[PDB]
Amino acid sequence: WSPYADNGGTIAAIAGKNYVILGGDTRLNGDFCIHTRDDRTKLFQLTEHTFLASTGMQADRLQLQQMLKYRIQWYQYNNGGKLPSTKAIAKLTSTMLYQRRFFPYYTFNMVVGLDEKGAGVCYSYDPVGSTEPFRYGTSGSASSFVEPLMDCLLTRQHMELSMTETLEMLKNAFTGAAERDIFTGDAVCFHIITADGIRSELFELRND
Amino acid sequence: MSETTIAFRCNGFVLVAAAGLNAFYYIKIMDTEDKVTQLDSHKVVACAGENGPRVNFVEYIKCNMALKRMREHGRVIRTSAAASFMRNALAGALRSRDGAYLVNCLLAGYDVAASSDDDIATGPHLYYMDYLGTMQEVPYGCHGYGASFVIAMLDRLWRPDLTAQEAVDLMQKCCDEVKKRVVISNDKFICKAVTENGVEIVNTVS
Amino acid sequence: MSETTIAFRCNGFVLVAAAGLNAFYYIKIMDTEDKVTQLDSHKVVACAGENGPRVNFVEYIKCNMALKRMREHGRVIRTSAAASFMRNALAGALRSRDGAYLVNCLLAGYDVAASSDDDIATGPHLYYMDYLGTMQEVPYGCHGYGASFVIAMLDRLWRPDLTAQEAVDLMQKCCDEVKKRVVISNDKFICKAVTENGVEIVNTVS
Amino acid sequence: SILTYSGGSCLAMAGDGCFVIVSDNRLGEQLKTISMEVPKLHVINESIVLGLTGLRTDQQTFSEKVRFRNELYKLREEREIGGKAFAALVSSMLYEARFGPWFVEPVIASIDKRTGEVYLCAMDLIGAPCEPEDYVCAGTCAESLHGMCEALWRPGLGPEELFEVAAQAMLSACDRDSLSGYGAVAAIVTRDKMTTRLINGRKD
Amino acid sequence: TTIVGVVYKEGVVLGADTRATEGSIVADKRCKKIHYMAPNIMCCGAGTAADTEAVTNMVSANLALHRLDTGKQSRVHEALTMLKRHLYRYQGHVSAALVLGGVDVEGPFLATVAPHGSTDRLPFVSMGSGSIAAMSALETGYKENMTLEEAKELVASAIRKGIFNDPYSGTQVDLCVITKTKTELLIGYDKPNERKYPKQEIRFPPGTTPVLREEIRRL
Amino acid sequence: MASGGSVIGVKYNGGVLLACDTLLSYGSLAKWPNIPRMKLVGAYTVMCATGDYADFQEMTTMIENHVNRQQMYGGGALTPNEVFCYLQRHVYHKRSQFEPCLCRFVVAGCHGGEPFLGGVDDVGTRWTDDCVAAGYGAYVALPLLRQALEKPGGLTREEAIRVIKDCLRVLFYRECRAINKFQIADATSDMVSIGEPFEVETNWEYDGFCFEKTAIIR
Amino acid sequence: TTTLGFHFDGGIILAVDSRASSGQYISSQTVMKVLEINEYLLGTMAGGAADCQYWERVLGMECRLWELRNNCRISVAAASKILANITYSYRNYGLSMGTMVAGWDQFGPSLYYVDDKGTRVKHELFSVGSGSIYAYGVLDQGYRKNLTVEEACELARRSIFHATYRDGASGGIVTVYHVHQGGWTQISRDDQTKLYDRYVL
Amino acid sequence: TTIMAVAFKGGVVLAADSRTSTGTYVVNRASNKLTKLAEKIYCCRSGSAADTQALAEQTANYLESYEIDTSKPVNVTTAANIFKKLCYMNKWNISAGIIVAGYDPLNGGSVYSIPSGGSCVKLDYALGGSGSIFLYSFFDANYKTGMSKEECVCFCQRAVAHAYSRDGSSGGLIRTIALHQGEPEDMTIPWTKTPYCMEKDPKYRDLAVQNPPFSSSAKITVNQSRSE
Amino acid sequence: TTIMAVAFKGGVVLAADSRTSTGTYVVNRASNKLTKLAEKIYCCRSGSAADTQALAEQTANYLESYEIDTSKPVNVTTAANIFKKLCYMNKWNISAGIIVAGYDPLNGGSVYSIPSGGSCVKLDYALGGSGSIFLYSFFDANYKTGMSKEECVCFCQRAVAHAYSRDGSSGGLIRTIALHQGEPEDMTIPWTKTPYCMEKDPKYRDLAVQNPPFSSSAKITVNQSRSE
């Protein structure tokens, strides 16, 4: 018996000048089998401008999502009803992960949302909580594929996008990951975050 | 045993020397760290070990000795009493939760009369200690990989009636033989004398 | 990595240096062993490792090269052919019953025309090898704990057109930095040049 | 790991009557770099290139054995060996060491002179082959390379377009790997000619 | 890997999936796992690929020598004996699991060979990491004296259970039908995993990559 | 270390079925063949588990007491969704103190004209779906039930019972620690009933199973 | 990782690279490895990123409280001592940390090294990280007390460059800071691949 | 696995179950563990399938050669001795418990046991496999010498059914063969017609009371069957 | 150890052997493994002597207090529940298999099994100890519900004799106690009057033929008894 299990799958995000787009796959894997093809626990809304996304062990992301939801509720009760910013939540998350240094959450997390100027931002964490702000990010079983592709198409060191064009690039990156990683597949849930609100969309992938 | 320490007493003094080296695995960071620390006007301790334990151990001894001084009208404490307190702190730590202090020491002092009622025999004293809490008064003593070479030399050449000049010469021969025969580089030594007038640096030894 | 070896080639020579130390655990037995061995009139190899494997490996290479010489009218063999034979002996031993020869080498030579029919490009050559049988031609190279310090210096200061005097100066700075920064004492170096006139000791380096 | 001790990576891609094969230039000892000028490609004859990754002593030993067998083949048979027979030969030499293996992972690319058909193969270290029609990859940044090619490769490219795709795949993957880099070398092979190019990359 | 066989009225049907993996990555989406042994005998393999390949090639060559010597058709029991003796000598170190099928003068024959060298002759089998899922369709669907068409539909349904439920199996179904007179291979008999969203094309303009040097050679 | 084998469940149009066998084993020994392994919880819910029977008993006794008391003391009747959440937090807490509940659970119920089905594993992983299983049921039965749920519209009660029996048949052929004696629970119309034990029909007489053909030496 | 610092006549120079690697895969090329603790003190990280970032933030909090309660700035000797007490108390709990602490106070410029076992050392020059063993080669060749600010910045930049070119775990962007009497300044940021083109002549 | 052999007046009966397993999954539900060594001599095999198949085949090869060289049918004692020698020379590298049994005109019906370790013991009956442990007491209470051939077939079928109802590693068909001066008679009973199983024994029909409903009394009555 | 309890019409019988051993040496040949918990409730103990003695004593202490506080005699289900809780809370530090059985006027005769792990199961009969494995088949073939008190004593004596004749870790006396509405009746059978042993079974009187004399024939006849 181990207290750890890897349930598989992949997340990715890309920020723009005034949006961020975030995607997670829906398969939950067991040992040599599949529990379900329609799990929705990888993305978790924290405010109207901020999401948590996690890969790794599903039981640990369920605990971390609830611990954050309660610290954010206490912040509103102690601050006149107001919600914390994306930057404030990102620092809180770092601090909560390090305080469990000695029996760590088995999770690879991202915080994504809009900053105060209204631009997208992605924070990626190692499991004890080191992070930095960046324009894109990915973690999970297919992340070593997707990440070099994002470097190639978005920074172009060896050689402004619309919401629509950015969403097409992620559709194509997940389609490629589903063909070559055995633990990623079935569907992607995408959230588009803008100042107005949050649009959602489901996208089919290969089922084998 | 990467750092060697040497000491010996003669009729009116104790000489104490220690190597300057600080290392990180196989890299020399510096070779001028002073490891012969002064505890009060007439006492020094030379310690061998990693910086963390060495510094935390000598600051703990210095603090307790300063406290004891002012609850006693500022009178100099005897060398055997300081030795007894150090041994009791090393042995205590060995059976504690945090574990032993991994340090090996030589403590040297010159005792001086408190008052006119004082019937103490005045003189120099030298105590060998190890990290477990073993403690023995000795005429000379050493720690580190170089220890065995120097001890044999002193068994051959030391006498109680060496003059100050003969003793400084003898300490320079001891340090040179450590450089000659030990693979681990101990290139600079710092040396101090303890006498009836206090503690002074000996500049002609290196 | 207790012994450091250094080499570099410029337009008409290769310089090769190695530390003299022989040790038994933490005791220096001697510090003047010559580890830069001459294989023929225009070739040397510098080896790092324990005496037993080092000596048995260079005597095996010397013997086979002498045999090959006399079944060939006494003609000097090319440096790339000697390198190829050494690599094949190291790789062979790795998959043998007795196990690998634990030695790391630098081989240097100056190729000279056999006859008037010879269309060989004359010049100096330097090959890095490791105990597994890896072999690469390089402009400069090093083994031992000191290697990383010297390589960075040479990346900064080496050029192909150094004169003989500039090169001897540059080799002395490399040896001094090993003494400054490596805990294991490497106090004496022996250095040799390989040129169109053969192999000579450079006495001004130590 | 013994396969990652020395560094290096290799990729090959197929097009319309052509292939491109690419390697990195680094040689190391774990994180220390010995040289920045060690490509891992070997030209066997006009129609065939072999890329070898793995431990460097076994790359040098195994490629010398392969060149020796190839020389004796030409004298016995009086012809050049073709790509499918060459890969079968290499697989047989690896399986001979089944229980004490050569630590190498070969990539093989060839073009049949007559027909214009391209043949690619990659093998594991005991000789099991895989023969796709698109691309093969091996070495320290294999997982990243495998994903770059799936995204950029498409059917029916000519020499120059196929070159661009292979260079970008090799440079993006090497930038996420500590053990492979310092630019790349590529061979472009058609029925008619063989071109070779040196590609500029990062210096870390 | 999922591999399957059944006996019908006049023959044997073998099946396999086509994915090869290293670790958690799909190395090859169309690996062939159905190997030729003789004109009347076929083999599918699970296990270490190199071991499976080597063993089946060696026995296929020794059966060909024996047909030239004797002048007679190869018997499936001979193939089975030769595989078993080789595997037993290496004590499981040559890790090949095999499904063997064929037809000779004594009718259809189907068997398995485990890596330690044990055998089993049966009317339906499965092996590989998808074997438990596939065997659930065989026990619910098998019957005596199936027609050829019933038998192809049953083998394809067993391989699809492995494809959809086991992470190490995938892509498509290959079949092989073996009768007294002929052996027919049907690669891509069923393809239930096409592309959903067409591949976006990413054009790099020629001249995009910086080059330092160039050499050319005519052939 | 009495232990139970496989459990399987499936949703149909109007309800949910849960099935397992009446056996507890101790290692390979088949020790008690007449044990009811399904437990009712409150008014709407039933649960079963694969693995350590003592841990199943401790956990279910504790949840049943909480549900009966909350109702008796004026805090309403817990729904299957709430019971499931509560179970999962208890299993995760024990995992986090290194004293795990060494079982895998399946929970089914019906409330509000809406059926529930879910699983929880011994590190606290949780999921809901149209079919769920534990033990060898996860390898043997899910492939068959997932194929039956592919038809559009959903299953009728009769189709659901028929595919459940095909699954139990295969478990008896291929799971070593099993017997041919099963119960089915049906949750539908905001209640649960547990049926009497029954047996399935099996085939042993194929020509290919005969003494001559299976012989090793001819 | 590679970090270095030294003390010359005009203050303290600090310089770093920017890569984060497990030991094969490169997770980032843009980590900031100099921590602006407050406006008169700097730290550096090597070892575990998370450990250095968390405990340096704790130390910045302790420095600001000192300033509120005593109405003056804490000395470098005290700041470094607060960090070394923390690491010493956790010496059996498996931190990985190799920091420098630098500042200019009433006794002048001071540079300390502090590690994960409670070590604390004061000296004129240090290098830390897996690339340190290459950077000391170049630095020991060029270092003297009488460098001008421009020469000292160049020496520091060239030393991190040579480490990045040979060590697999170092690379990215080279950053140089100057600690002076008025506090500290960021002097420069340069990609190590642009620097290669300026030094290969 | 459950195997056995029993002597009767003028011959022997061998019997077995048909299951082969990896521990908790059944790879073959219809194996045949009664292996022929000569016309009237068979063995029963337990342990590693690979090892027992290989040693049975080798023993059979040697008996066929011996029979051609002497021009007579072989005795049971010769088959037991050859088999014993192979088990004993290879004891550290195999997992095998064997029973050799058969008929010859010199000694009649004979049974030999060759357990792990390679000893050889001549008996009136022998038991082997994981399931044997359940049968020592069944034979101690219900076995007698001098049974007829039909008594002995029926007894061995019942014995195998009892062992496989309690042992998770045994199951499936019951195979028997009877060897005497006439022709060998094999028989296969399917699970559906087994002479004993727990599932149809009336003392195990009613379920234990583990789940009593919530009540105002401490009296235990019935299991809850419907929601409250 | 061999322990058991069986229900009959209006009560229970408990039975055990009397041996305690360190593996291959017998430290006590007359232990008593039927331990009293209340006037009509007993347990049977297997596993570590130290652990079972300590938990029986604690369970008995709690039942005596409960009985004084309510002024009524306790039910079997209460004793089983208290004992289960102690076995389950201490499962990682003990070796214990328990059977609790007794009579009370609410539920009549009841038997509960509490094996390693701390589960609790209510049954018609229970078996425990190393010797139990030999008895599953004996009960499957020869046990029926509704036996009388005298039938049930005789049956349990026979069952214990069969297990201890095959199990090296069991032996010595057979102890029984019968609990019903009347007074408890204990009985001890000595080995010399056991109802079954191998040593007196006539099918094991004649020795196997392992040591035949040197002969001119391959026929096997008798064991050599005197020197040539």
PDB file of N, CA and C in Angstrom, chain D residues 46 95 98-99 126 128 130 143 146 150-154 163-164 167-168 190-200, chain E residues 25-29 49-51 54 93 199 201-204 207-219:
ATOM      1  N   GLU D  46      26.053   5.723 -50.536  1.00  0.00           N
ATOM      2  CA  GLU D  46      25.325   6.865 -51.069  1.00  0.00           C
ATOM      3  C   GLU D  46      23.850   6.842 -50.687  1.00  0.00           C
ATOM      4  N   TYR D  95      21.155  -8.534 -31.219  1.00  0.00           N
ATOM      5  CA  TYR D  95      20.538  -9.666 -30.528  1.00  0.00           C
ATOM      6  C   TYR D  95      21.616 -10.676 -30.132  1.00  0.00           C
ATOM      7  N   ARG D  98      22.302 -10.337 -26.476  1.00  0.00           N
ATOM      8  CA  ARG D  98      21.003 -10.241 -25.833  1.00  0.00           C
ATOM      9  C   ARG D  98      21.147 -10.093 -24.329  1.00  0.00           C
ATOM     10  N   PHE D  99      22.054 -10.880 -23.734  1.00  0.00           N
ATOM     11  CA  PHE D  99      22.176 -10.961 -22.284  1.00  0.00           C
ATOM     12  C   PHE D  99      23.375 -10.166 -21.746  1.00  0.00           C
ATOM     13  N   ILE D 126      18.418  -4.145 -27.981  1.00  0.00           N
ATOM     14  CA  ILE D 126      18.599  -5.563 -28.293  1.00  0.00           C
ATOM     15  C   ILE D 126      18.036  -5.917 -29.663  1.00  0.00           C
ATOM     16  N   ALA D 128      15.037  -4.916 -31.578  1.00  0.00           N
ATOM     17  CA  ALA D 128      13.666  -4.936 -32.062  1.00  0.00           C
ATOM     18  C   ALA D 128      13.388  -3.725 -32.945  1.00  0.00           C
ATOM     19  N   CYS D 130      11.199  -1.014 -35.613  1.00  0.00           N
ATOM     20  CA  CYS D 130       9.930  -0.358 -35.865  1.00  0.00           C
ATOM     21  C   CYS D 130      10.105   0.512 -37.107  1.00  0.00           C
ATOM     22  N   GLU D 143      11.392  12.035 -25.926  1.00  0.00           N
ATOM     23  CA  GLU D 143       9.980  12.361 -25.674  1.00  0.00           C
ATOM     24  C   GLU D 143       9.559  13.704 -26.286  1.00  0.00           C
ATOM     25  N   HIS D 146       9.630  13.411 -30.270  1.00  0.00           N
ATOM     26  CA  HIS D 146       8.523  12.583 -30.735  1.00  0.00           C
ATOM     27  C   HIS D 146       7.266  13.429 -30.871  1.00  0.00           C
ATOM     28  N   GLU D 150       5.255  14.885 -34.571  1.00  0.00           N
ATOM     29  CA  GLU D 150       3.824  14.661 -34.719  1.00  0.00           C
ATOM     30  C   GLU D 150       3.075  15.955 -35.061  1.00  0.00           C
ATOM     31  N   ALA D 151       3.552  17.102 -34.566  1.00  0.00           N
ATOM     32  CA  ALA D 151       2.887  18.373 -34.822  1.00  0.00           C
ATOM     33  C   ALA D 151       3.269  19.007 -36.161  1.00  0.00           C
ATOM     34  N   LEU D 152       4.528  18.869 -36.634  1.00  0.00           N
ATOM     35  CA  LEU D 152       5.041  19.617 -37.789  1.00  0.00           C
ATOM     36  C   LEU D 152       5.102  18.774 -39.065  1.00  0.00           C
ATOM     37  N   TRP D 153       5.275  17.461 -38.962  1.00  0.00           N
ATOM     38  CA  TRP D 153       5.461  16.657 -40.166  1.00  0.00           C
ATOM     39  C   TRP D 153       4.138  16.585 -40.893  1.00  0.00           C
ATOM     40  N   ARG D 154       4.192  16.618 -42.225  1.00  0.00           N
ATOM     41  CA  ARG D 154       3.047  16.229 -43.026  1.00  0.00           C
ATOM     42  C   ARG D 154       3.541  15.535 -44.289  1.00  0.00           C
ATOM     43  N   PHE D 163      13.548  19.947 -44.838  1.00  0.00           N
ATOM     44  CA  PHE D 163      14.674  20.391 -44.043  1.00  0.00           C
ATOM     45  C   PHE D 163      14.247  21.362 -42.931  1.00  0.00           C
ATOM     46  N   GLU D 164      13.427  22.377 -43.263  1.00  0.00           N
ATOM     47  CA  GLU D 164      12.955  23.360 -42.288  1.00  0.00           C
ATOM     48  C   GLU D 164      12.230  22.744 -41.103  1.00  0.00           C
ATOM     49  N   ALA D 167      14.815  20.760 -38.821  1.00  0.00           N
ATOM     50  CA  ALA D 167      15.649  21.639 -38.032  1.00  0.00           C
ATOM     51  C   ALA D 167      14.856  22.238 -36.868  1.00  0.00           C
ATOM     52  N   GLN D 168      13.650  22.756 -37.101  1.00  0.00           N
ATOM     53  CA  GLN D 168      12.868  23.334 -36.020  1.00  0.00           C
ATOM     54  C   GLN D 168      12.524  22.294 -34.949  1.00  0.00           C
ATOM     55  N   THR D 190      18.698  12.714 -51.726  1.00  0.00           N
ATOM     56  CA  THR D 190      17.776  12.383 -52.821  1.00  0.00           C
ATOM     57  C   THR D 190      18.413  11.264 -53.637  1.00  0.00           C
ATOM     58  N   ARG D 191      17.738  10.820 -54.706  1.00  0.00           N
ATOM     59  CA  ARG D 191      18.335   9.860 -55.636  1.00  0.00           C
ATOM     60  C   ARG D 191      19.611  10.428 -56.263  1.00  0.00           C
ATOM     61  N   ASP D 192      19.589  11.739 -56.555  1.00  0.00           N
ATOM     62  CA  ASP D 192      20.576  12.421 -57.377  1.00  0.00           C
ATOM     63  C   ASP D 192      21.732  12.998 -56.561  1.00  0.00           C
ATOM     64  N   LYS D 193      21.474  13.534 -55.361  1.00  0.00           N
ATOM     65  CA  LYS D 193      22.553  14.169 -54.620  1.00  0.00           C
ATOM     66  C   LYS D 193      22.419  13.976 -53.110  1.00  0.00           C
ATOM     67  N   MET D 194      23.509  14.310 -52.408  1.00  0.00           N
ATOM     68  CA  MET D 194      23.517  14.385 -50.961  1.00  0.00           C
ATOM     69  C   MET D 194      24.095  15.723 -50.506  1.00  0.00           C
ATOM     70  N   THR D 195      23.275  16.516 -49.825  1.00  0.00           N
ATOM     71  CA  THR D 195      23.681  17.791 -49.260  1.00  0.00           C
ATOM     72  C   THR D 195      23.863  17.651 -47.747  1.00  0.00           C
ATOM     73  N   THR D 196      24.735  18.466 -47.155  1.00  0.00           N
ATOM     74  CA  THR D 196      24.966  18.468 -45.721  1.00  0.00           C
ATOM     75  C   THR D 196      24.973  19.910 -45.237  1.00  0.00           C
ATOM     76  N   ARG D 197      24.320  20.220 -44.121  1.00  0.00           N
ATOM     77  CA  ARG D 197      24.298  21.578 -43.592  1.00  0.00           C
ATOM     78  C   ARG D 197      24.536  21.620 -42.087  1.00  0.00           C
ATOM     79  N   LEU D 198      25.209  22.672 -41.625  1.00  0.00           N
ATOM     80  CA  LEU D 198      25.411  22.935 -40.215  1.00  0.00           C
ATOM     81  C   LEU D 198      24.414  24.007 -39.793  1.00  0.00           C
ATOM     82  N   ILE D 199      23.640  23.710 -38.756  1.00  0.00           N
ATOM     83  CA  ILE D 199      22.571  24.545 -38.235  1.00  0.00           C
ATOM     84  C   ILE D 199      23.065  25.222 -36.961  1.00  0.00           C
ATOM     85  N   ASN D 200      22.839  26.532 -36.852  1.00  0.00           N
ATOM     86  CA  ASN D 200      23.225  27.296 -35.672  1.00  0.00           C
ATOM     87  C   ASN D 200      22.190  27.146 -34.551  1.00  0.00           C
TER      88      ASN D 200
ATOM     89  N   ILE E  25       4.446   6.319 -23.771  1.00  0.00           N
ATOM     90  CA  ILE E  25       4.421   6.912 -25.100  1.00  0.00           C
ATOM     91  C   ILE E  25       4.085   5.857 -26.152  1.00  0.00           C
ATOM     92  N   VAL E  26       3.342   6.272 -27.175  1.00  0.00           N
ATOM     93  CA  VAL E  26       3.048   5.455 -28.329  1.00  0.00           C
ATOM     94  C   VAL E  26       4.144   5.632 -29.379  1.00  0.00           C
ATOM     95  N   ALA E  27       5.068   4.682 -29.423  1.00  0.00           N
ATOM     96  CA  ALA E  27       6.141   4.612 -30.417  1.00  0.00           C
ATOM     97  C   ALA E  27       5.662   4.363 -31.836  1.00  0.00           C
ATOM     98  N   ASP E  28       4.781   3.381 -32.031  1.00  0.00           N
ATOM     99  CA  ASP E  28       4.330   3.057 -33.382  1.00  0.00           C
ATOM    100  C   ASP E  28       2.823   2.818 -33.351  1.00  0.00           C
ATOM    101  N   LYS E  29       2.068   3.491 -34.184  1.00  0.00           N
ATOM    102  CA  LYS E  29       0.640   3.266 -34.152  1.00  0.00           C
ATOM    103  C   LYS E  29       0.224   2.087 -35.029  1.00  0.00           C
ATOM    104  N   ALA E  49       9.405  -7.505 -27.680  1.00  0.00           N
ATOM    105  CA  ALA E  49       9.350  -7.594 -29.135  1.00  0.00           C
ATOM    106  C   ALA E  49      10.524  -8.356 -29.760  1.00  0.00           C
ATOM    107  N   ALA E  50      11.757  -8.128 -29.308  1.00  0.00           N
ATOM    108  CA  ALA E  50      12.947  -8.692 -29.932  1.00  0.00           C
ATOM    109  C   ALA E  50      12.955 -10.212 -29.780  1.00  0.00           C
ATOM    110  N   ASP E  51      12.480 -10.680 -28.608  1.00  0.00           N
ATOM    111  CA  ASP E  51      12.480 -12.090 -28.211  1.00  0.00           C
ATOM    112  C   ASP E  51      11.451 -12.843 -29.055  1.00  0.00           C
ATOM    113  N   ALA E  54      12.728 -13.033 -32.676  1.00  0.00           N
ATOM    114  CA  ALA E  54      13.838 -13.947 -32.865  1.00  0.00           C
ATOM    115  C   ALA E  54      13.408 -15.408 -32.884  1.00  0.00           C
ATOM    116  N   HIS E  93      13.752 -16.243 -19.473  1.00  0.00           N
ATOM    117  CA  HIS E  93      14.577 -15.089 -19.820  1.00  0.00           C
ATOM    118  C   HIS E  93      14.283 -14.626 -21.250  1.00  0.00           C
ATOM    119  N   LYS E 199      -5.959  17.919 -39.067  1.00  0.00           N
ATOM    120  CA  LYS E 199      -4.669  18.444 -38.650  1.00  0.00           C
ATOM    121  C   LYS E 199      -4.452  19.832 -39.258  1.00  0.00           C
ATOM    122  N   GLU E 201      -2.256  22.749 -40.496  1.00  0.00           N
ATOM    123  CA  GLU E 201      -1.007  22.728 -41.231  1.00  0.00           C
ATOM    124  C   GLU E 201      -0.181  23.926 -40.761  1.00  0.00           C
ATOM    125  N   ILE E 202       1.080  23.685 -40.382  1.00  0.00           N
ATOM    126  CA  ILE E 202       1.950  24.730 -39.853  1.00  0.00           C
ATOM    127  C   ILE E 202       3.088  24.945 -40.846  1.00  0.00           C
ATOM    128  N   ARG E 203       2.978  25.985 -41.687  1.00  0.00           N
ATOM    129  CA  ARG E 203       3.938  26.198 -42.763  1.00  0.00           C
ATOM    130  C   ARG E 203       5.107  27.011 -42.211  1.00  0.00           C
ATOM    131  N   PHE E 204       6.333  26.508 -42.414  1.00  0.00           N
ATOM    132  CA  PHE E 204       7.544  27.291 -42.210  1.00  0.00           C
ATOM    133  C   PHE E 204       8.047  27.752 -43.575  1.00  0.00           C
ATOM    134  N   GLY E 207      13.960  29.134 -45.814  1.00  0.00           N
ATOM    135  CA  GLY E 207      14.912  30.158 -45.387  1.00  0.00           C
ATOM    136  C   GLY E 207      14.769  30.549 -43.907  1.00  0.00           C
ATOM    137  N   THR E 208      13.775  29.953 -43.213  1.00  0.00           N
ATOM    138  CA  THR E 208      13.427  30.234 -41.819  1.00  0.00           C
ATOM    139  C   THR E 208      14.574  29.928 -40.848  1.00  0.00           C
ATOM    140  N   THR E 209      15.280  28.813 -41.075  1.00  0.00           N
ATOM    141  CA  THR E 209      16.314  28.330 -40.169  1.00  0.00           C
ATOM    142  C   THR E 209      17.673  28.943 -40.532  1.00  0.00           C
ATOM    143  N   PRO E 210      18.436  29.516 -39.567  1.00  0.00           N
ATOM    144  CA  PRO E 210      19.808  29.977 -39.825  1.00  0.00           C
ATOM    145  C   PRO E 210      20.837  28.861 -39.998  1.00  0.00           C
ATOM    146  N   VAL E 211      21.599  28.951 -41.095  1.00  0.00           N
ATOM    147  CA  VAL E 211      22.605  27.974 -41.480  1.00  0.00           C
ATOM    148  C   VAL E 211      23.962  28.681 -41.496  1.00  0.00           C
ATOM    149  N   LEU E 212      25.021  27.983 -41.045  1.00  0.00           N
ATOM    150  CA  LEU E 212      26.373  28.530 -41.024  1.00  0.00           C
ATOM    151  C   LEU E 212      27.194  28.048 -42.224  1.00  0.00           C
ATOM    152  N   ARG E 213      26.974  26.800 -42.682  1.00  0.00           N
ATOM    153  CA  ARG E 213      27.817  26.176 -43.700  1.00  0.00           C
ATOM    154  C   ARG E 213      27.050  25.084 -44.444  1.00  0.00           C
ATOM    155  N   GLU E 214      27.585  24.721 -45.619  1.00  0.00           N
ATOM    156  CA  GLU E 214      26.925  23.819 -46.551  1.00  0.00           C
ATOM    157  C   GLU E 214      27.971  23.118 -47.424  1.00  0.00           C
ATOM    158  N   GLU E 215      27.812  21.791 -47.589  1.00  0.00           N
ATOM    159  CA  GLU E 215      28.552  21.008 -48.574  1.00  0.00           C
ATOM    160  C   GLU E 215      27.568  20.224 -49.448  1.00  0.00           C
ATOM    161  N   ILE E 216      27.942  20.040 -50.730  1.00  0.00           N
ATOM    162  CA  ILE E 216      27.140  19.316 -51.714  1.00  0.00           C
ATOM    163  C   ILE E 216      27.976  18.193 -52.333  1.00  0.00           C
ATOM    164  N   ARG E 217      27.285  17.131 -52.774  1.00  0.00           N
ATOM    165  CA  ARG E 217      27.919  15.993 -53.422  1.00  0.00           C
ATOM    166  C   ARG E 217      26.945  15.367 -54.427  1.00  0.00           C
ATOM    167  N   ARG E 218      27.427  15.158 -55.666  1.00  0.00           N
ATOM    168  CA  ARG E 218      26.683  14.491 -56.728  1.00  0.00           C
ATOM    169  C   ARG E 218      26.997  12.993 -56.716  1.00  0.00           C
ATOM    170  N   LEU E 219      26.014  12.173 -57.128  1.00  0.00           N
ATOM    171  CA  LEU E 219      26.030  10.733 -56.890  1.00  0.00           C
ATOM    172  C   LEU E 219      26.224   9.965 -58.210  1.00  0.00           C
TER     173      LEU E 219
END
